[PDB]
Amino acid sequence: MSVIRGLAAVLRQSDSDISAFLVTAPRKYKVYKIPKRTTGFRVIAQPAKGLKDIQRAFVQLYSLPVHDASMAYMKGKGIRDNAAAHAGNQYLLKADLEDFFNSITPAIFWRCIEMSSAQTPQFEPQDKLFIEKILFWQPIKRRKTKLILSVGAPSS
DNA sequence: GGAAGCGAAAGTGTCGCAACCCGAGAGAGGAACGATCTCGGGTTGCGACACTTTCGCAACCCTTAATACGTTC
């Protein structure tokens, strides 16, 4: 059963319960606005508690490769290390990506899985739909194809 | 992604003005018939402008969030 079997073994729940939960999982999100520091608002989609636990279990079960140049969302590394990497230099080229989190789609995720140069955990073709439902958020109720990563989630 | 309003941008029709044409008419001259200038419609071309269509800004935040204190995405 692969992914669902491991999720059941971690959450101490039946396969049927998790499978029934992972039907509208891309839709079980609570969206809200936080105030910007100067003016305006920022919209965040946060999943429900059960989906949050499912995402945490999925993240801890499968270890995707990460690079040493990345400094966000890893243990023992953070703002201080990122700043100290360029501390001794003379010139910098800070640059940003346009709408980073909402531009990531399941197509991108599956393209990156297959061609990754490092070790990648093996996902059976039967559970790819469950992977997409677990990891990705679905804005717009009518559109079931639009699946994007949500900035702010245990798995994003 | 995109309510509801609204306005930008671009394309298309329209409608009034000018410019000209053409027939009617009173009657200059000088001895009659009708030159010549004007009146009244009528047609066409043209360009400014009104009207028409499409696009795009960005409400809300969906059932579904957490709430020691601070930076960062």
Side-chain angles (χ1 to χ4, degrees):
Chain A
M1 187 66 204
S2 177
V3 165
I4 301 306
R5 181 74 266 174
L7 261 62
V10 174
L11 272 78
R12 285 92 62 194
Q13 293 179 356
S14 77
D15 284 330
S16 160
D17 174 13
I18 290 177
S19 182
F21 188 101
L22 301 173
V23 175
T24 63
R27 178 70 275 172
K28 297 167 174 298
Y29 278 67
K30 177 58 169 286
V31 299
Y32 47 89
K33 307 198 272 146
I34 71 165
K36 273 177 173 242
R37 265 164 187 169
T38 50
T39 191
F41 289 105
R42 210 176 274 261
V43 178
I44 295 89
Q46 181 171 175
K49 294 178 286 294
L51 184 54
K52 265 193 277 206
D53 289 281
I54 282 183
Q55 291 179 325
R56 299 214 186 77
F58 176 78
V59 165
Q60 293 179 356
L61 274 166
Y62 305 98
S63 65
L64 303 172
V66 296
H67 199 246
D68 290 330
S70 296
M71 302 288 189
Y73 317 123
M74 294 182 286
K75 324 270 189 52
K77 300 166 74 172
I79 299 301
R80 205 199 51 205
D81 289 330
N82 188 22
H86 321 267
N89 282 164
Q90 192 174 6
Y91 310 124
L92 59 80
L93 185 48
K94 176 62 72 74
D96 291 331
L97 289 162
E98 200 148 38
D99 199 344
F100 173 70
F101 275 98
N102 281 14
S103 283
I104 297 171
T105 47
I108 293 175
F109 183 50
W110 293 128
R111 184 176 176 87
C112 283
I113 283 284
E114 63 190 1
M115 61 79 71
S116 79
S117 66
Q119 188 176 2
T120 297
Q122 191 75 15
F123 296 121
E124 292 180 351
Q126 188 258 327
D127 53 59
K128 309 206 149 204
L129 187 153
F130 293 99
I131 304 293
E132 300 180 351
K133 284 184 175 291
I134 287 163
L135 294 175
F136 293 87
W137 169 47
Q138 176 199 139
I140 297 89
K141 186 180 289 293
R142 65 179 177 88
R143 203 178 301 177
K144 300 262 180 263
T145 300
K146 176 146 167 59
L147 289 168
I148 57 171
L149 276 190
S150 159
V151 61
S155 73
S156 280

